[PDB]
Design an enzyme around this catalytic site. Structure first.
Site, PDB file in Angstrom:
ATOM      1  N   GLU A  11       5.905   5.627   5.413  1.00  0.00           N
ATOM      2  CA  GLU A  11       4.992   5.079   4.411  1.00  0.00           C
ATOM      3  C   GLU A  11       4.889   5.884   3.096  1.00  0.00           C
ATOM      4  O   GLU A  11       5.287   5.461   1.988  1.00  0.00           O
ATOM      5  CB  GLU A  11       3.616   4.833   5.116  1.00  0.00           C
ATOM      6  N   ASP A  20      -0.161  -1.451  -4.790  1.00  0.00           N
ATOM      7  CA  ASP A  20       0.591  -2.076  -3.733  1.00  0.00           C
ATOM      8  C   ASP A  20       1.729  -2.822  -4.338  1.00  0.00           C
ATOM      9  O   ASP A  20       1.752  -3.145  -5.529  1.00  0.00           O
ATOM     10  CB  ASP A  20      -0.264  -3.227  -3.230  1.00  0.00           C
TER      11      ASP A  20
END
EC number: 3.2.1.17
Length: 164
Positions: A11, A20
Site C-alpha cells: 500500500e 485517492d
C-alpha cells in the site's frame, strides 16, 4: 511478519492527507477520510479520527491504530460475506493475510467476485488458484503487489516480502 508491514509495503504509509486514485481524501495505510471534495472535511474527519488537532498530519503510531481498526472492520465484513467466509475460514494464518490484503485493496465486494479462484483456494489448489489469479485484471493493474500476494497463497509464507 505482519499485515501491517505487509500492507505497509504493498500500500504505502502516508502521513499527510493525500488524494485517492478516486480522489477521496485518504491517509495512513489507505485510510479514507472523506468522499467530500472538501479538504476542510478530511481535516475534521481526521482529527475526529485521531482525537487531536492533526493539521493534516499524523504519526506512524497513529497510522497503525487507524490501521488496526480498518483491519478488523475488513475482517468482519469478510465474515459477513457468505461467499468469503468459508474460504477465509479454511485458510491458514498466512493465507488469511493474503485474503485481507485483497479485501483491502478491493473491498469485500470486488474480492467476492473471484468465484473460481476462491473455490480453488477453498479446495487447496494453491498452484491453480494462483495461476488463476495470475490472469485477472487485478493482477494486471498492480503486478508486484499481485505477485507477492499470489505467491503467498501458493507458498503460504512471507518469502515474498523478505528481500525487497
Amino acid at each position: 511478519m505482519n499485515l501491517f508491514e505487509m500492507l505497509r509495503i504493498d500500500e504505502g504509509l502516508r502521513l499527510k492527507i493525500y488524494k485517492d486514485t478516486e480522489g477521496y481524501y485518504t491517509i495512513g495505510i489507505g485510510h479514507l477520510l472523506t468522499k467530500s471534495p472538501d479538504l476542510n472535511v478530511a481535516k475534521s474527519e481526521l482529527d475526529k479520527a485521531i482525537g487531536r488537532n492533526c493539521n493534516g498530519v499524523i504519526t506512524k503510531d497513529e497510522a497503525e491504530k487507524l490501521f488496526n481498526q480498518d483491519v478488523d472492520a475488513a475482517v468482519r465484513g469478510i465474515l459477513r460475506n457468505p461467499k468469503l467466509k468459508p474460504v477465509y475460514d479454511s485458510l491458514d494464518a498466512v493465507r488469511r493475510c493474503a485474503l485481507i490484503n485483497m479485501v483491502f485493496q478491493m473491498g469485500e465486494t470486488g474480492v467476492a467476485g473471484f468465484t473460481d479462484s476462491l473455490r480453488m483456494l477453498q479446495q487447496k489448489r494453491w498452484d491453480e488458484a494462483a495461476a488463476n489469479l495470475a490472469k485477472s485484471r487485478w493482477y494486471n493493474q498492480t503486478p508486484d503487489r499481485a505477485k507477492r500476494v499470489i505467491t503467498t497463497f501458493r507458498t503460504g509464507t512471507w518469502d515474498a516480502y523478505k528481500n525487497l
